[model samples]
Target: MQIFVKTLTGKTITLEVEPSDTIENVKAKIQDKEGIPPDQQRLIFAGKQLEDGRTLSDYNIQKESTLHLVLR
Candidate 1:
């Protein structure tokens, strides 16, 4: 499943990934595309900052859910 997140502009940005994709994987994507390190990434979902070591499924993330990214 290619899980996705929506931006404020309603533009859908997706990363090709399966349900097993981890939070670290998402961070890696951000790191690659935005030049922001995972350690420097603030990935917020469900009103909380996600842990790099945690899987997306572990947080029960749904398809096209809102995930906010903040950089330090």
Candidate 2:
């Protein structure tokens, strides 16, 4: 599935992920594209912060869902 990651800088990055992918997995992917470390990245979805160990399905994330990324 495809999801969106919106940064505080107003850039949106598209990522292809599996439902089983964990938040950390997504962060690693982001690091590859944006050069931001996972420890410094926070992901928010549905007004809640995503945990590293949690899968996308845990958050009920659907196709085309948008996750906000904030640098810590």
Candidate 3:
């Protein structure tokens, strides 16, 4: 499945990952792309934090779903 992620800086990235990928994995990828540390990553969807061990399905994320990230 593919998921769309947008950073606070307006940078958008689309990643092709498996359905079993966890949110933590996605956050790590985003951190790598944005040059931010994982500890500083804050991924939010629908005004809530994307908890570390959760899967996309746990958050009702779908294929092509978009998520936003804010770095702190």
Give me the candidate number with maximum lDDT: 2
Q: lDDT by residue for model 2 over 13-47, one digit each (tens)?
A: 99999999999999999999889999999999978
Candidate 2, residue 42: the lDDT equals: 93
lDDT of 3 by residue, 1-72 (tens): 888888777888887766677878887877677667878888887888998788877888888888887877
Q: How accurate is candidate 2 locally (lDDT)?
A: 0.95
Can you write out model 1's per-residue Cα lDDT over 23-55, one digit (the tens) per residue?
898988867866768887777787888888888
TM-score of each: 0.74, 0.95, 0.82
Winner by TM-score: 2
In candidate 1, list every pair of residues with a backbone clash: none
Ranked by lDDT, the better of candidates 1 and 2 is 2
Candidate 3, run of 10 with poorest lDDT: 27-36
Ranking by lDDT: 2, 3, 1
Clashing pairs in 2: none
**So what's the TM-score on candidate 3?**
0.82
